[PDB]
Amino acid sequence: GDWSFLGNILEEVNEHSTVIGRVWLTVLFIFRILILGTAAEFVWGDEQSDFVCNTQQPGCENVCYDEAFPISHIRLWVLQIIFVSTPSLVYVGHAVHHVRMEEKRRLEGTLLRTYVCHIIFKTLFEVGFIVGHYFLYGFRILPLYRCSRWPCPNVVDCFVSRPTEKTIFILFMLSVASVSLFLNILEMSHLGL
Amino acid sequence: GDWSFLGNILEEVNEHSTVIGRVWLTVLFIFRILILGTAAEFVWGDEQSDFVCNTQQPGCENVCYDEAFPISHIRLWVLQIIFVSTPSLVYVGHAVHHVRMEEKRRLEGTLLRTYVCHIIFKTLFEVGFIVGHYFLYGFRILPLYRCSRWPCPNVVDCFVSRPTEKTIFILFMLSVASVSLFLNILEMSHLGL
Amino acid sequence: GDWSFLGNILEEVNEHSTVIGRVWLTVLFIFRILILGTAAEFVWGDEQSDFVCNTQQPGCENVCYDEAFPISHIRLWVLQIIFVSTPSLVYVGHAVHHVRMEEKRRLEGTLLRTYVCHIIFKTLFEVGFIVGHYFLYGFRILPLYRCSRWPCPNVVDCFVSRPTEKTIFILFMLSVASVSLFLNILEMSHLGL
Amino acid sequence: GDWSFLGNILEEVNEHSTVIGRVWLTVLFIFRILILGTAAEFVWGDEQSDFVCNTQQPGCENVCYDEAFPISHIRLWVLQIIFVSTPSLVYVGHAVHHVRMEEKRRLEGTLLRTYVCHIIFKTLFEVGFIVGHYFLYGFRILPLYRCSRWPCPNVVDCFVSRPTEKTIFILFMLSVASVSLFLNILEMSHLGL
Amino acid sequence: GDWSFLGNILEEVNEHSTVIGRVWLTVLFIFRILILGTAAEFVWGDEQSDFVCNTQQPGCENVCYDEAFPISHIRLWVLQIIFVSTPSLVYVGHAVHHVRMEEKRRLEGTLLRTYVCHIIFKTLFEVGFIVGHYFLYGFRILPLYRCSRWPCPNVVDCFVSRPTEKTIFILFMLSVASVSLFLNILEMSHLGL
Amino acid sequence: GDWSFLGNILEEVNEHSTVIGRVWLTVLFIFRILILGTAAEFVWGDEQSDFVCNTQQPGCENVCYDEAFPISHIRLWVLQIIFVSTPSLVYVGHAVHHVRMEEKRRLEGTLLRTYVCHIIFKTLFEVGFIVGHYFLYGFRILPLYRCSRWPCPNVVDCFVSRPTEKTIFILFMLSVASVSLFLNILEMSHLGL
């Protein structure tokens, strides 16, 4: 997809942020969005097309693929990016609002609170998405999925496409998110000092 | 699709709008257009291709898919975006017209009325599209669709692609639209004060 | 497709036009080109691929699809856009020519005539395309097409893809074109006064 | 394909050209490149995929499609555009060369000759491509192609995809090219006066 | 593919080059890259998909297609473009280096040598790629390919997609490369004088 | 994929780097990213679709393709590019930080250390990816892959798509990486002097 607008706003943010914050935005762009667009999206391109179940029951493949993957990982990661970005948008909006107010007439006591809260919310969203991914899928995609969802007769064997590659990228994204967390915590500590 | 032109005009609007209004435009861009383009459009990509009916009647799949999905959700959402955007275009056009008039020779009594009416119309279109979606599809896509449309013999079983993921995104868009409504109402209240 | 160049010229026109004219160009961009690119083109994407005829005669599907859809609606609409845009290009060219002439050495008596004629021609092309669409396809796409074109033996039953959605968008475009006509007529009246 | 670079150069040309010449470049952009990119290329998208021959001889479809369409119309039109554009590039290069020469130290006697010759060559290339198209394909694509090319046993019947639509666009392009010719001739006459 | 970056650098080169050199870069852009992107890449799009062998041996089509086309022509041409472009990059880098050196503190004796060597290397790479193409594929793609590569039993008949069109474009590219050579030689002669 | 953002940052780096460093960035752009996007990605486009195994066991093709290619080469190369680029981002960030610090109030003793370490890390990542590729795949892709992974009965024969072309590009990328190493070493030596 096209991320140009979000990139515009976030680049604008870069100016109004801590050094750790600029590192965080660089990470967001390079190791999440770029990889999604150029590496991961191709990996999941044939997720359902090459999902194959050992049966001749009509509709069994559509229901078994939907059971194994209620939301695809790539879409989960899209949502994750958007939600961890939103607070930064809030903060830069507050900043530009104060700027226009001063013109009509940096991290002051008024902004500081908003900035800290935005770091806090980035952290909360990151942790939430990581936990949700863990419970939904674990962190490994196994090649065999056994499904007993109607209309499938008894339990059928279905086989996932590219399970090892998908696992590699799952773990890669997990690590990127953990790095984001570390950065957020160090930024809170730096402000504290 | 390419939304660049609409984005140009709406970015122009951002200047001539209330703080709540700028939040609303940010929402429009990030949580509706971006998601459509990068997440939802892939979800619905194989909507008809992976729609499968248990029959060997020719033409039964084309007529049963058309019965279940008279308009696809993604196209409904496109139309929604365009129609909720139009009033903002009207208002910014009025603004630039007054600007050129003054040059030849902010929210004044002349504009205020137009602005309030444009908020009102955004609200009406949002509510209308939400209601229309509810009656057309409810808010859950079930995996099994039973169809009795000619040429299908008797009632046939057809199976939808990615029903759970489509449901997730349906609800997501519903929530985004509700947030838009709340923003519009708070903007009317703010003007009232 | 890529409409960037036409958009450049037409944006240039926006300056040299009446307020109604700027509304007309806004409509052209938002409700015709954007929709084509992001909504309609996907609807017609599988027009022939999912066109299915009840026969085992080779070549019957290629000849029956060509009979039902001699020109696809999307291409008809492309041509329509281009032809209703051309006169505006003529007028802005005349304007820039007079500008360069004056530099070497707004709606004057010389331009006024050209402007009125360009409105007239926009109107004629719009009416012509609407009428042509009516005679070629009516304004509803029915699900069943019966074809007796060689090599098909006797009359065969063919089934169209996405007939209801295609009908929705057909009517939508009809309405957009009618709005364009109303705008053109009001612009002629405004000039008359 | 991406025509951006050629568009850059030709837009640069627009300044250094006659009024008829600017009309010609506008035509080139709007009625040839835009249509190719947004209308015609989709029409020919499934040219070979939906080419079907009544046989069960392996390789018969690959050899019969190659016999009927040695070069596809869309690629012929691409080449046409490039070759009718080249002379304009030559002329603008000569112009910028004289400009730099004068700086180191409009249609003069030196340029006039080059300009006239470039018009002449545009005309020659246009006529050549039109004639070549006529002999290669006539100007109508018939639905049935009968092929006797090895490995096909005896004469086989093959059926073309979208013959009527392809015919419509063939004639459209023919008309565009004829308009280009008329423009070139009027430009020569205008210079003559 | 996206050639934007290379285009940036080469456009930068245009300033620092002979008139013949600017012609050469214009050729590179218009008659090699543009054609690849808009004409040739579609021709080779279904190269393997529509490659068909008369056999029911599994794996025979994958091994026979790989034998006939060890590297596809389009990728060969990509590499060719990149390698004939590299020396121009070297030269413009040398130029900007001397510029920065002079600022800290045209074709001089220092640059002249580098320029001549870069022309020489362009020529060598062009000749090498032309010769390599000749030995790898001749200059005509025949419709029938006979393959005896394991697992195929005995010799099997395989049929190429679009052989005549591919031949047309092969010869076209050969001619473009020969024109490049002529330009390089004339540039060396011009410098010599 | 879209590499625009990374390209922005790296172009920014070009200014703050040694001449050898600018050569290295030019290589990165032209011989790694451009080739990936325009040549290699098409080569691997049908990697799994045209992967064929001699069996009628369901799921055997999905598990045998995943065994032969746990990560596809193209994605490996993407990751490689990103990781060899990261240190340059670190260094330019340090540079801009010192710039802003000086404004509030080239290769100095403070920067020199960071620069040398960033060269060192580029080298380490390059060597690591080269070694990892060697152990994962060797440097030749053979046409036949024999797989005994459940559910396949006994050992089955699977046939790779485009093995010779993939081998050519594998070796090409190996050579590009080796050139990068040589450049890094010469840059360390140059600094040492």
Residue numbers in the entry:
A (entry chain F), B (entry chain A), C (entry chain B), D (entry chain C), E (entry chain D), F (entry chain E): 2 to 106, 149 to 236
Quoted from the paper:
The connexins are a family of transmembrane proteins (21 isoforms in human) that form intercellular channels for cell-to-cell communication. These intercellular channels establish a ~1.4 nm pore that couples the cytoplasms of neighboring cells and enable direct passage of electrical and small-molecule signals (such as ions, second messengers, hormones, and metabolites)3 and therapeutic agents. Intercellular channels are constructed by a dodecameric (12-mer) assembly, with six subunits assembled into “hemi-channels” that dock together through extracellular domains, resulting in a continuous ~1.4 nm pore for intercellular permeation. Here we present an electron cryo-microscopy (CryoEM) structure of native connexin-46/50 (Cx46/50) intercellular channels stabilized in a dual lipid nanodisc system at 1.9 Å resolution—providing a near-atomic level of detail for this class of membrane channels.
Another notable feature of the lipid densities observed in the CryoEM map is that PC head groups are not observed, despite sufficient resolution to expect such features. In each of the 3D classes, PC head groups and/or phospho-glycerol backbone of individual annular lipids were uniquely resolved (PC Class 1–3). The conformational state of Cx46/50 is very similar in all three classes, and essentially indistinguishable from models derived from the ensemble density map (Cα r.m.s.d.’s = 0.24–0.34 Å). For example, the SN2 acyl chain of PC Class 1 overlays with the SN1 chain of PC Class 3 (yellow and blue). Likewise, the SN1 chain of PC Class 2 also overlays with the SN1 chain of PC Class 3 (orange and blue). This suggested that multiple, overlapping, configurational states are capable of supporting the same lattice of acyl-chain positions observed in the CryoEM reconstructions, consistent with nonspecific and/or transient binding interactions. Collectively, these observations support the notion that although the Cx46/50 acyl-chain interactions appear to be high affinity, the lipid head group interactions are nonspecific and adopt a variety of configurational/conformational states. Notably, the most stable (yet overlapping) configurations (e.g., 1–2 and 1–5 configurations) are the same as those resolved by CryoEM 3D classification (blue and yellow, respectively).
